[PDB]
Design a protein around this ligand. Structure first.
Ligand SMILES: N=C(C(=O)O)/C(=C\C=C/O)C(=O)O
Ligand SMILES: N=C(C(=O)O)/C(=C\C=C/O)C(=O)O
Ligand SMILES: [Fe+2]
Ligand SMILES: [Fe+2]
Ligand SMILES: [Fe+2]
Ligand SMILES: [Fe+2]
Lengths: 175, 175
């Protein structure tokens, strides 16, 4: 039947043409709408303090510039570098916090639409003792409608930010 | 928990290092094993006469060289060009026959593991009248174990190759 997502098109020129969105305050841009594969380009700079718990895999291809992922691997904080040219496949539920220090960077990220009932988690961890400070689970439909208010409500709440283990109040927006 | 699929790694150098498999007789190479996202690099030259009917989406990013897809769109034969640098998202069930004339070409193709019961189709069409000549449906586990014998059994069988509409016997392996 129909090429529902349109014809093939030149990706570098698309990234060039959307450079103004691959920077603060927007930072990323989904390529196709209403598809099963969620295909996004993510730019920079953006730093962030949440860890994502994705119930499905995520594919990364760092096309331009460098970035890295703060991870929880086997109970310990680790870093996975996404150097320019690198590809990477993240297994389900590995906690990850992408850090994207460079302007002009661009990373292809491919994920799957989550089926009804399969929820995403977003988590913050205590800088002092490492315990989990706060988790929100969300039926994720769009990283535009369902996600910013989630982060904003954490920054706005000393209670949400308060470590249950040691009482230290997480800093909120910037580490 | 674990980085089950390993650390990030440089993709161009991987493609360089696997160049000897991105050519006849192998032609392609899956990047990671036992993952939900099936991530493959496909090289050339390869021409082929089957149309794939994939019950899920396929993502294409033609990294090196040029290729194209013969399609059935809205009842008519069409061609979608994959020029170097192009990306493309194919909707489910659009019949497609990839043609990869160039040596040294490389296309990133990402698909999903099909769940039990969701079958792939492989189809051949009559050059003369355009009617369907033969379809095989397969629970696809690997494009290495389940796929070559399927194609080989079509080439080996004048009966399978015989157009039901006009009686013309499809040529088999090479158009
Ligand atoms: N990989 C993510 C994600 O954490 O799901 C991302 C950007 C937005 C959507 O993927 C990023 O900055 O890499
Ligand atoms: N896109 C395919 C497919 O038809 O599923 C392919 C190679 C092998 C696996 O995808 C190709 O040559 O593009
Ligand atoms: Fe994520
Ligand atoms: Fe703490
Ligand atoms: Fe296919
Ligand atoms: Fe025919």
């Amino acid at each position: 039947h129909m090429l529902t997502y349109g014809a093939p098109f030149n990706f570098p020129r698309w990234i060039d043409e959307h450079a103004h969105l691959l920077k603060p305050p927007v930072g990323n841009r989904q390529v196709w709408q209403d598809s099963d594969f969620i295909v996004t380009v993510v730019g920079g700079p953006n730093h962030r303090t949440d860890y994502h718990d994705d119930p499905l895999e995520e594919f990364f291809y760092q096309l331009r510039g460098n970035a890295y992922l703060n991870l929880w691997v086997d109970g310990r904080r680790e870093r996975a570098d996404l150097k320019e040219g690198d590809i990477f496949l993240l297994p389900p539920h590995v906690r990850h916090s992408p850090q994207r220090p460079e302007a002009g960077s661009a990373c292809l990220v491919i994920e799957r639409q989550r089926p009804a009932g399969m929820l995403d988690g977003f988590e913050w961890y205590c800088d002092a003792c490492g315990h989990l400070v706060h988790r929100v689970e969300v039926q994720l439909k769009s990283i535009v409608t369902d996600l910013p208010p989630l982060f904003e409500s954490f920054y706005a709440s000393e209670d949400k930010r308060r470590c249950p283990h040691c009482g230290q109040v997480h800093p909120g927006r910037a580490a």
